[PDB]
C-alpha cells in the first residue's frame, strides 16, 4: 500500500506552509484545516501520503477553447494525484469529470469589499461600472458567473469577462490585497470571507450568499477511496470534530 | 405628527420583553436587535411610536381557503400598523401585498437539530419518515416549502402538510423545544439558528442554507415611510451600526 | 346596461361552488376556470352579471323525438340567458342554433378507465361487450357517437344506445365515480380527463383523442356580444392569460 | 441468435447521444425514451442489438418521381435493419410497405410558434402569406399535408410545396430554431411540441391537434418480430411502464 499522492492548494486557513525555527520535513511542512482533515483521513482509513501543491496553481476550470480542465481537477483526471484535499467546491460541472466525497463544509459565494460604502449587494455592483470587481481565475466562483442565467450575475460576468486580465486574479489572496489597495470588490466563498474579515477590520462581506455549495475531497472518477472518504468525513461530522477544526482555524 | 403604530413579534434576540425590578413603561418595556433598530429609525426619521405585538401572534401567510393574509402582513394590509419592525422575511408573495425596506440583515433557511446524529442535510431528513421535522406555522419558511418545486423540498412539504398539527408549531421557540425533547428537526432561519446554537451546545445547524433572503421593515403598500426607512437602514449599514447591533445581541 | 344573465353548469375545475367559513354572496359563490374567464370578460367588456346554473342540469342536445334542444343550448335559444360561460363544446349541430365565440380551450374526446387493464383503445372497448362504457347524456360526446359514421364509433353508439339508461349518466362526475366502482369505461373530453387522472392515480386516459374541438362562450344566435367576447378571448389568449388560468386550475 | 440491427433517428427526448466524460461503448452511447423502450424490448423478448442511425437522416416519405421510399421506412423495406425504434408515426401509406407494432404513444400534428401573437389556429396561418410555416422534409407531417383534401390543409401544402427549399427543413430541431429566429410557424407532433415548450418559455403550441396518430416500432413487412413487439409494448402499457418512461423523459 504505497503512499497516496494528495494534491492541494495554498489558501489560508485551509492550507499553508507551517513556519518553524527548525527545519520541517514531510507532512509537517504544511498545516491548516484541510491538512488536519487529511491527517484524520489517513489514520481512520489507514494510508500514508505525500502532499503536492497543484503545479499550475489553479483550483480547476474547463478551457473555453479546447474544453480541457486545469488545476487540481485536471491533476485528478490525469491520475497525477489520488486525492485532492483542499477547499475544493463540489460543483455539477466538476462532478462530470471527477468524484467528490460528501461535503466537509458548506458555504456560498459572497462579496468581499471595504466597509463604509453604499454598496450593499451584488445588484449595487452590477448597476455601476466605476467600481471593478472580479474573482480568482479558473475557480468555481468564476465558473458560477460564467454559467449564470440570472440577469444580475450574467451582466456581472459580461463585465468581468470583458476585463478578464485586469479583474480576474491569480489567487484569492491577490483579490483580497487588491480590495485593500484599490476601489475593488472581490467575489469569493463565504467561509474564507469570514476568515478574512475576522483579521481585517477594514473589510466586510457585502450582502448575503449568492449560492449554496460545499467543499469535498476530490478523487479521480471511479476511485475506490471516494466512498471510504465520505464515511470518514461523515464520521468526523457526527462527532463534532469538523466543527472543532473549523473553530481551531477560524476562531 | 401622531405616533406611529409599530407591529412586531416576540423572537429572541430580535424582540423580547425587557426584564426589570422597577415597572417599565412605553417603549422601554421591550428590547432586542429590532427594538434598537426601531429606536434608531425614530430619531433618524423623526417620529414617536407605540409598539404593539401582532394580535394573532403570527408572522404572515396567505390562507389556502379564502386567500386572506394573517400575522403582521395582514395588520399592515389593513392599516392596523404603520410599520412592522421585526425579523420579517422579505419574500415575493409578501411584496405583492405589502412593501419592504431594503434588508437590514441577510439570512437563509436551514435546519436545527441535535448533534451527534448521521443527519447532515435536508436530503437526509427527506429520505426518511422516522425523524419528524417542521417549521413555524404561517411563516416564510413554511411558505417556502409549500411553494417549492424542488424535489427534496416538495416531498418535505408533503410530509409536513400531512402532519400539520403535529409538526408545524405556533412559535419558533416551540419548535426549538421540540428539537430538545423529541426526535425532531426544525426548519428555521440561519440568523436565529446561530443565536440558538450559541446558547445550546447540544444543538447544531444541519447542512448549509436552503435559500437566501433578508429581513426588512414592512409597511402598508404605498406607504411614504418605506423609502425613508430604506435610507435610514442603508445609512446604519454603511456606518457599521447594523453590524454593531448584531454583535451586541448575538454576542 | 342591466346585468347579463350567464348560464353555466357545475363541472370541476371549470365551475364549482366556492367553499368558505363565512357566507358568500353573488358572483363570489362560484369559482373555477370558467368563472375566472367570466370575470375577465366582464371587466374587459364592461358588464355586470348574475350566474345561473342551467336548470335542467344539461349541456345541450336535440331530442330524438321532437328535435327540441335542452340544457344551456336551449336556455340561450329561449333567451333565458345572455351568455353561457362553461366547458361548452363548439359543435356543428350547436352552431346551427346558437353562436359561439372563438375557442378559449382546445380538446378532444377520449376514454377514461382504470389502469392495469389490456384495454388500450376505443377499438378494444368496441370489440367486446363485457366492459360497459358510456358518456354523459345530452352532451357533445354522446352526440358525436350518435352521429358518427365511423364503424368503431357507430357500433359503440349502438351499444350505448341499446343500454342508454344504464350507461349514459346524468353528469360527468357520475361517470367518473362509476369507472372507480365498477367495470366501466367513460367517454369524455381530454381536458377534463387530464384533471381527473391528475387527482386519481388509479385512473388513466385510454388511447388518444377521438376528435378535435374547442370550448367557446355560447350566446343566443345573432347576439351582439359574441364578436366582442371573441375579441376578449383572443386577447386573453395572446397575453398568455388563458394559459395561466389553465395552469392555475389544473396544476 | 445474432444481434438485431435497430435503425433510429436523433430526436430529443426520444433518442440522443448520451453525454459522458468517460468513453461510452455499444448501446450505452445512446439514451432517451425510445432507447429505454428498446432496452425493455430486448430483455422481455430476448435479443441483443446494435443501434444504427438512419443513414440518410430521414424518417421516411415516398418520392414523387420514382415513388421510392427513403429514411427508416426504406431501411426496413430493404432489410437493412430488423427494427426501427424511434418516434415513428404509424400511417396508412407506411403500413402499405412496412409493418408497425401497436402504438407505444399517441399524439397528433399541431403548430409550434412564438407566443404573444394573434395566430391561434392553422386557419390563421393559412389565410396569410407573411408568416411562413413548414415541417420536416420527408416526414409524416409533411405527407399529411401533401395528401390532405381538407381546404385549409390543402392550401397550406400549396404554400409549403411552393417554398419547399425555404420552409421544409432537414430536421425538427432546424424547424424549432427557425421559429426562434424568424417569423416562422412549425408543424410538428404534439408529444415533441410538449417537450419543446416545456423548455422554451417563449414557445407555445398553436391551436389543438390537427389529426390523431401514434408512434409504433417499425419492422420489415412480414417480420415475425412485429407481433412479439406488440405483446411487449402492450405489457409495458398495462403495467404503467410506458407512462413512467414518458414522465422520466418529459419531466
Ligand atoms: N474554492 C474555489 C476557488 N475559489 O475560492 C473562492 O473563494 N472562490 C473561488 O472560486 C474552487 O474550488 O474553485
Ligand atoms: N422570519 C419568518 C418567521 N419564521 O422564523 C423562521 O426562522 N422561519 C420562519 O418561517 C417570517 O418572517 O415569516
Ligand atoms: N363539454 C360537453 C359535455 N360533456 O363533457 C364531456 O367531457 N363530454 C361531454 O359530452 C358539452 O359541452 O356537451
Ligand atoms: N415522427 C415523424 C417525423 N416528423 O416529426 C414531427 O414532429 N413531424 C414529422 O413529420 C415521422 O415519423 O415521420
Ligand atoms: Cl508531504
Ligand atoms: Cl410601546
Ligand atoms: Cl352570481
Ligand atoms: Cl449500439
Amino acid at each position: 500500500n504505497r503512499s497516496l499522492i494528495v494534491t492541494t492548494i495554498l489558501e489560508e486557513p485551509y492550507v499553508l506552509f507551517k513556519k518553524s525555527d527548525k527545519p520541517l520535513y514531510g507532512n509537517d511542512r504544511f498545516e491548516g484545516y484541510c491538512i488536519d482533515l487529511l491527517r484524520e483521513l489517513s489514520t481512520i482509513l489507514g494510508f500514508t501520503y505525500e502532499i503536492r501543491l497543484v503545479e499550475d496553481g489553479k483550483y480547476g476550470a474547463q478551457d473555453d477553447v479546447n474544453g480541457q480542465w486545469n488545476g487540481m481537477v485536471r491533476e485528478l483526471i490525469d491520475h497525477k494525484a489520488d486525492l485532492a484535499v483542499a477547499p475544493l467546491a463540489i460543483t455539477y460541472v466538476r462532478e462530470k469529470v471527477i468524484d467528490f466525497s460528501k461535503p466537509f463544509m458548506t458555504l456560498g459565494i459572497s462579496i468581499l469589499y471595504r466597509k463604509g460604502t453604499p454598496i450593499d449587494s451584488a445588484d449595487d455592483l452590477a448597476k455601476q461600472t466605476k467600481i471593478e470587481y472580479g474573482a480568482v481565475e479558473d475557480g468555481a466562483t468564476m465558473t458560477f458567473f460564467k454559467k449564470s442565467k440570472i440577469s444580475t450575475y450574467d451582466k456581472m460576468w459580461a463585465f468581468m469577462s470583458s476585463r478578464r486580465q485586469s479583474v480576474l486574479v491569480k489567487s484569492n489572496e491577490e483579490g483580497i490585497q487588491r480590495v485593500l489597495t484599490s476601489d475593488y470588490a472581490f467575489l469569493m466563498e463565504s467561509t474564507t470571507i469570514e476568515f478574512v474579515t475576522q483579521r481585517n477590520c477594514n473589510l466586510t462581506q457585502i450582502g448575503g450568499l449568492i449560492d449554496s455549495k460545499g467543499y469535498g475531497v476530490g478523487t479521480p472518477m471511479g476511485s475506490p477511496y471516494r466512498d471510504k472518504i465520505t464515511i470518514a468525513i461523515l464520521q468526523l461530522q457526527e462527532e463534532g470534530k469538523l466543527h472543532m477544526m473549523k473553530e481551531k482555524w477560524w476562531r
Side-chain angles (χ1 to χ4, degrees), chain A residues 14 17 29 34-36 42 57 78-79 90 106 111 119 130 163-164 167 170 174 193 205 211 215 237-238 241 247 250:
Chain A
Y14 313 92
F17 294 118
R29 294 172 300 165
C34 285
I35 300 304
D36 280 349
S42 72
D78 298 334
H79 287 198
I90 296 162
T106 53
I111 305 165
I119 298 300
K130 173 183 177 59
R163 312 184 185 200
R164 167 182 292 283
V167 306
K170 292 290 186 180
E174 192 185 321
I193 292 177
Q205 177 178 299
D211 81 336
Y215 288 153
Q237 184 58 265
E238 311 172 311
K241 182 56 182 184
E247 292 306 305
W250 269 255

Side-chain angles (χ1 to χ4, degrees), chain A residues 11 59-60 87-89 94 136 138-142 172 187-189 192 215:
Chain A
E11 198 75 280
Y59 279 86
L88 190 67
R94 284 174 174 171
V136 66
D138 301 305
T141 293
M142 184 207 90
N172 285 310
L187 281 287
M188 66 181 298
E189 302 163 334
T192 315
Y215 288 153

Side-chain angles (χ1 to χ4, degrees), chain A residues 6 25-30 38 49-52:
Chain A
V6 177
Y25 302 99
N27 302 163
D28 301 317
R29 294 172 300 165
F30 304 87
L38 173 55
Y49 57 89
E50 273 176 40
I51 294 170
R52 281 182 174 51

Side-chain angles (χ1 to χ4, degrees), chain A residues 11 20 23 44 54 60 74 85 96 102 107 109 113 120 140 157 166-167 177 188 190 205 209 213 217 227 232 244 250:
Chain A
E11 198 75 280
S20 179
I44 293 172
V54 59
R74 177 59 179 284
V85 183
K96 303 297 82 66
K102 289 295 184 179
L107 50 136
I109 292 170
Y113 191 51
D120 198 47
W157 176 241
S166 297
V167 306
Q177 290 300 306
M188 66 181 298
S190 60
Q205 177 178 299
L209 272 34
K213 69 193 70 183
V217 174
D227 292 333
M244 182 182 293
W250 269 255

Side-chain angles (χ1 to χ4, degrees), chain A residues 9 21 30 60 74 88 95 107 114 120 125 133 136 144 160 168 187 199 208 221 228 237 248:
Chain A
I9 190 167
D21 59 297
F30 304 87
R74 177 59 179 284
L88 190 67
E95 294 173 320
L107 50 136
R114 315 184 307 289
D120 198 47
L125 278 183
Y133 48 85
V136 66
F144 172 81
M160 302 187 276
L168 296 195
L187 281 287
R199 291 171 183 54
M221 193 166 273
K228 300 178 178 178
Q237 184 58 265
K248 173 186 175 185

